[PDB]
Amino acid sequence: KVWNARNDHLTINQWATRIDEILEAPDGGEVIYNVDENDPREYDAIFIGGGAAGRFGSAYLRAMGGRQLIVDRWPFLGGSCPHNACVPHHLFSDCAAELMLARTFSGQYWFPDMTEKVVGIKEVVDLFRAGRNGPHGIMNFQSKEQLNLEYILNCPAKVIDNHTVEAAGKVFKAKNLILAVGAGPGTLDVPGVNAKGVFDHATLVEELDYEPGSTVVVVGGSKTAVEYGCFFNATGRRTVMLVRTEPLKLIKDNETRAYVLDRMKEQGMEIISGSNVTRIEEDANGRVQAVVAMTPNGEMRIETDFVFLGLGEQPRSAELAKILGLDLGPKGEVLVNEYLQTSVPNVYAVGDLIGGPMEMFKARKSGCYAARNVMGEKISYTPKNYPDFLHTHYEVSFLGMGEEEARAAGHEIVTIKMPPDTENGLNVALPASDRTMLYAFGKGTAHMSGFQKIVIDAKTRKVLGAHHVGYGAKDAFQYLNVLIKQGLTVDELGDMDELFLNPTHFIQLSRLRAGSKNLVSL
Amino acid sequence: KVWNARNDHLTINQWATRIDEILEAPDGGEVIYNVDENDPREYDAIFIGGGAAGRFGSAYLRAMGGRQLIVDRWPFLGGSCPHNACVPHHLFSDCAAELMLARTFSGQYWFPDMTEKVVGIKEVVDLFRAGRNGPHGIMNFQSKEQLNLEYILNCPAKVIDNHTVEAAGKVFKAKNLILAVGAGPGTLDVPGVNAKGVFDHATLVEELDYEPGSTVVVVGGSKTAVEYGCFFNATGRRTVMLVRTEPLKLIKDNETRAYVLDRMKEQGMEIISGSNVTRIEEDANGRVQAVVAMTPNGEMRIETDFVFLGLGEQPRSAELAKILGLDLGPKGEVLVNEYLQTSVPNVYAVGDLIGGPMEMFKARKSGCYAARNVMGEKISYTPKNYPDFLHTHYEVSFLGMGEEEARAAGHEIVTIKMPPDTENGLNVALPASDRTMLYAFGKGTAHMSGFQKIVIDAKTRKVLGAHHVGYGAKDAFQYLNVLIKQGLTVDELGDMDELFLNPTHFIQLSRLRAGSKNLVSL
Numbered sequence A, B: 001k002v003w004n005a006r007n008d009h010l011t012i013n014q015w016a017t018r019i020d021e022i023l024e025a026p027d028g029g030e031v032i033y034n035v036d037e038n039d040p041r042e043y044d045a046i047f048i049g050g051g052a053a054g055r056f057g058s059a060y061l062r063a064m065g066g067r068q069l070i071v072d073r074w075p076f077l078g079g080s081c082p083h084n085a086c087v088p089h090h091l092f093s094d095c096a097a098e099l100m101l102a103r104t105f106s107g108q109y110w111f112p113d114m115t116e117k118v119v120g121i122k123e124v125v126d127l128f129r130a131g132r133n134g135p136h137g138i139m140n141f142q143s144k145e146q147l148n149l150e151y152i153l154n155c156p157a158k159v160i161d162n163h164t165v166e167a168a169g170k171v172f173k174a175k176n177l178i179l180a181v182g183a184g185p186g187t188l189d190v191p192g193v194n195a196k197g198v199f200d201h202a203t204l205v206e207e208l209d210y211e212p213g214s215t216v217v218v219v220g221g222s223k224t225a226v227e228y229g230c231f232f233n234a235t236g237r238r239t240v241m242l243v244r245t246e247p248l249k250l251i252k253d254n255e256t257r258a259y260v261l262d263r264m265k266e267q268g269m270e271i272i273s274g275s276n277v278t279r280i281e282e283d284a285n286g287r288v289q290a291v292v293a294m295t296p297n298g299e300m301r302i303e304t305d306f307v308f309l310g311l312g313e314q315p316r317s318a319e320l321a322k323i324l325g326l327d328l329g330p331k332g333e334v335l336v337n338e339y340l341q342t343s344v345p346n347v348y349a350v351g352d353l354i355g356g357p358m359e360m361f362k363a364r365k366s367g368c369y370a371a372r373n374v375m376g377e378k379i380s381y382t383p384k385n386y387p388d389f390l391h392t393h394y395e396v397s398f399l400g401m402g403e404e405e406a407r408a409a410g411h412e413i414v415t416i417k418m419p420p421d422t423e424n425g426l427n428v429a430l431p432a433s434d435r436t437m438l439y440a441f442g443k444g445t446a447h448m449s450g451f452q453k454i455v456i457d458a459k460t461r462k463v464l465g466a467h468h469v470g471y472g473a474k475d476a477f478q479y480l481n482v483l484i485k486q487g488l489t490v491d492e493l494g495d496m497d498e499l500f501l502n503p504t505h506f507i508q509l510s511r512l513r514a515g516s517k518n519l520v521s522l
């Protein structure tokens, strides 16, 4: 059953409704076929997958006057991001942050008494499931009506060879393939891993048909594990994170990492380093009842009926590699050169399929650079020196070098931080700005008002790294990183116009010290 | 009593406690005397006032190796900002944003029932009052111990001539004066303005000895009026704004201003344009009971026991201009040239005393620039092309040109915005990021998820303006403005590394259009 959608013009909200209908149809729903049957030009590229990489790649290719076709097995464009990855992740992190605020000020002002309050995880997941077609609807609309994309959705692609793809029972030819099928959730090789009650980011939002009990176990120690783990904890649940090595190694600044981990522990999270699950115990109903794990302090058993795996994502390379003869790396990533070209002539690979860093900027940018190459513009892509962030119950942003890292690299350094390093320590009403004001003024809560630091070369006066725990700095790090890569000094930073009270206090604190030829930390 | 504090070394929290004693001393308290009795250099500059401009001016002058003294009539440094201006404003705005969220999701998830809920205005002001000695503490601490400054606090300065000041029973000498006494709240010349129950930002935090009733009248239609008015409204009080002309003229982009005003009215704010208060009515106890105003539709009377004036701030120029004979401008601002020099030899003026823009960047920078000029380094300062922000129940950030502005100005332009212009209008799940996810996903709340736009020159491809309503962009606008001043194009914007999901979607939305030589709006 093929719906010829070319000459239909659904609104965003009609698209949202229609996608929902197709997703819910017992038979699997109709194919969405949006192809210009009157255009005689050959396809410059067929994209296998229309997630962040395939969709942006197609948008750019089309903007350059080339012809593209997306094939995606989902009835929407945008891939994992709206459906089960960054979007739900951010809804859950918004909840985690507000819940920490509510629990900190329990029984003060407008805040409800949270003492005995357990928030339903399923309730919030269901809110996500009920609203996720909004972003789906915009993706289908924007792609067709504003970006002029051709696509076939709700259809697994069947790659024939490096120039030939079957979709919707039609065979299409192209000058190139861009492979954009992303990566699937990592798993554990232990008894019980397939028990009901074991989830990952993908299955959480498809299969949670009960409300978890009082204890949650999270496996993993980076972004996904810590993001979902803080949300679970914020709902009122005892949360134990089993971390194979050490948690949050992405936070290179030791003081920043410590603040973040300390705040997580204050919220009641238990974070266990050097630990590996050995078994997930099932009850006689087939649901998880406990997790057994080896740690540096011997075997532990944690009773729980809800386990969340936040391991890495595994590139979806197997089928395509068999068909096309693609060279793969150790973790199954499709090997590419710096023009995104695979070992196979005229076949590019992009997004999570080509491995880490698995981020939206990497996905969209690799998509567009492959598209430029297909359109005859020789352009390399090597992601390097990018800013980064993750959520706990706070926003955590970082770029460049940690303070220790900068010294080990041979730099003489000063730092500018908040709060100052004093006898009263964190227990002072700084740093403060939007969404930290209550922490800053509340009785005994001032230590929660945030932490931040820039790392500066004492000789060149260049800013070598920036680090922030709080709210409202993440967006700023995108732009600040560009200024830093251009060579930003403490002097130039001090010379900017601040917008006080500012999530980053870097500008004015830089100004307080830049009047000196010999720089001193603040 | 004059306390020689020079060799005492209070912590931040010790300072906090002790400014308290002094402020709540029945007699006015001792003078805080922090002067270096060894230094034989003559003062390069005495600063009259130790607020933002005075304090930062001193920091920089001292950093450059010069000698400074601050005289301030408060027992703390930092000026209006920590005591009654930006800091309490940000606390009230945090409450306003959090309260809109709670009222929107009342009786859902963790959110309690807000239906009959009136939050205490006095309670929140008392919270501010109870904690502001935190910030005062950091201020005196960091100024003495970290920034190596000399100061005399809790003592009004008596300026004798352009080289002489009396303070703490003593007479001081200096090569220059830097006049930095700020501005005081504007008022009305109507009967009843001196009634009990009429406040401005300064008196609200000193004299609020009751809980306001159910209607609040705000007078004014710019930053202060809208910031405090949204907070009053967020507490659950009927809030009527009486606006001489039109509200929020600072928001130049028409659609951006409309979104902001639309969301204010949706929260239940009443904004009456073209209106002037004619009488504040008093009850038999001399308390406000109503406001009478002339409007375009004739006289109106609003019953109320709490009036908030959010008018201009007026430069404190009178006394100083009499003692020194300074030239003033038409609002009483001390006139200065590009080096911050007044009409009087060796006397400079900075901060709010020199007029608009009355912002922290301006006060601190004008402060530092006058210090550099005092120190022989000839540097000119004319604030222009700065970013700006205000709070409603949202953060509202803006720089450069609005859309209509740019076309009227003879720029051929394209716009990249979110949500798109479609028949579903604002009722779609974008824009979305931290602190707008619940709006994005909730039933009937999607129009609340925000609004944003960049304005782009179609031929140079340069970004001419940027506009954002939501949360978490304010800090970015600091850094984004600098890039725009350096010549930022849509292609350079698109080439950056976004941190998805980002408060500003500008990077990726630019990337969607940047592949075409002829740009098309999104």
Ligand SMILES: Cc1cc2nc3c(=O)[nH]c(=O)nc-3n(C[C@H](O)[C@H](O)[C@H](O)COP(=O)(O)OP(=O)(O)OC[C@H]3O[C@@H](n4cnc5c(N)ncnc54)[C@H](O)[C@@H]3O)c2cc1C
Pocket: A048, A049, A050, A051, A052, A053, A054, A071, A072, A073, A074, A078, A079, A080, A081, A084, A085, A086, A089, A155, A156, A157, A180, A181, A182, A183, A201, A224, A313, A316, A350, A351, A352, A353, A358, A359, A360, A361, A363, B499, B500, B501
């Ligand atoms: C929980 C989680 C949270 C994250 N949070 C963030 C974040 O906050 N910020 C950030 O930058 N990144 C985040 N990421 C990473 C981000 O989601 C990915 O890097 C990105 O989505 C990768 O895009 P992609 O196009 O490569 O793959 P995908 O989004 O996975 O798209 C692949 C597409 O290929 C299609 N497909 C697969 N096989 C076939 C086939 N046989 N036939 C047809 N179609 C097929 C799929 O239907 C899918 O639509 C997060 C990831 C996860 C897992």
Ligand SMILES: Cc1cc2nc3c(=O)[nH]c(=O)nc-3n(C[C@H](O)[C@H](O)[C@H](O)COP(=O)(O)OP(=O)(O)OC[C@H]3O[C@@H](n4cnc5c(N)ncnc54)[C@H](O)[C@@H]3O)c2cc1C
Pocket: A499, A500, A501, B048, B049, B050, B051, B052, B053, B054, B071, B072, B073, B074, B078, B079, B080, B081, B084, B085, B086, B087, B089, B155, B156, B157, B158, B180, B181, B182, B183, B201, B224, B313, B316, B350, B351, B352, B353, B357, B358, B359, B360, B361, B363
């Ligand atoms: C309600 C409100 C909210 C605001 N919010 C923001 C914001 O969010 N962001 C922003 O950038 N700006 C904001 N502003 C503007 C900002 O407060 C001012 O631009 C800034 O405080 C001006 O600094 P200043 O040093 O010039 O004056 P002030 O901070 O007022 O300092 C003046 C000092 O002079 C002293 N003084 C006066 N007379 C004497 C005397 N004769 N002897 C000794 N000392 C004397 C006073 O004690 C005072 O300490 C806000 C203003 C208001 C009113």
Ligand SMILES: NC(=O)c1ccc[n+]([C@@H]2O[C@H](COP(=O)([O-])OP(=O)(O)OC[C@H]3O[C@@H](n4cnc5c(N)ncnc54)[C@H](OP(=O)(O)O)[C@@H]3O)[C@@H](O)[C@H]2O)c1
Pocket: A089, A186, A187, A188, A219, A220, A221, A222, A223, A224, A225, A227, A243, A244, A245, A246, A310, A311, A312, A313, A356, A357, A358, A359, A389, A390, A391, B500
């Ligand atoms: N921007 C965001 O907020 C966000 C949110 C979610 C995901 N993401 C992105 O999505 C990508 C996913 O891949 P990744 O680079 O995160 O993978 P990764 O770094 O290899 O691993 C992620 C975590 O899984 C753990 N892990 C992997 N295999 C394990 C195993 N067999 N047993 C126990 N633990 C195991 C790792 O622990 P050790 O390192 O301790 O071995 C690590 O903590 C990341 O790049 C991430 O940045 C981003």
Ligand SMILES: NC(=O)c1ccc[n+]([C@@H]2O[C@H](COP(=O)([O-])OP(=O)(O)OC[C@H]3O[C@@H](n4cnc5c(N)ncnc54)[C@H](OP(=O)(O)O)[C@@H]3O)[C@@H](O)[C@H]2O)c1
Pocket: B089, B186, B187, B188, B219, B220, B221, B222, B223, B224, B225, B227, B243, B244, B245, B246, B310, B311, B312, B313, B356, B357, B358, B359, B389, B390, B391
């Ligand atoms: N960064 C921030 O978020 C922030 C927050 C608060 C304050 N501030 C600063 O504090 C300064 C205060 O000065 P301002 O610029 O607000 O002064 P302004 O522009 O002269 O006036 C501010 C508002 O008061 C109104 N007003 C003035 N006199 C009035 C009168 N007699 N009757 C009725 N209304 C009157 C004006 O109305 P009309 O225009 O309708 O005549 C305007 O709405 C500002 O410059 C601002 O920079 C900054």
Ligand SMILES: CC(=O)CSCCS(=O)(=O)O
Pocket: A051, A052, A053, A055, A056, A077, A078, A079, A081, A082, A087, A135, A136, A138, A139, A364, B430
């Ligand atoms: C609506 C939305 O942005 C969903 S997540 C991003 C998908 S895409 O724009 O990267 O294809």
Ligand SMILES: O=S(=O)(O)CCS
Pocket: B051, B052, B053, B055, B056, B077, B078, B079, B081, B082, B087, B135, B364
């Ligand atoms: O600008 S100052 O640091 O003096 C005051 C900030 S509240």
Ligand SMILES: [Mg+2]
Pocket: A419, A426, A427, A428, A429, A430, A431, A440, A446, A447, A448, A449, A450
């Ligand atoms: Mg603090």
Ligand SMILES: [Mg+2]
Pocket: B419, B426, B427, B428, B429, B430, B431, B446, B447, B448, B449, B450
């Ligand atoms: Mg919306």
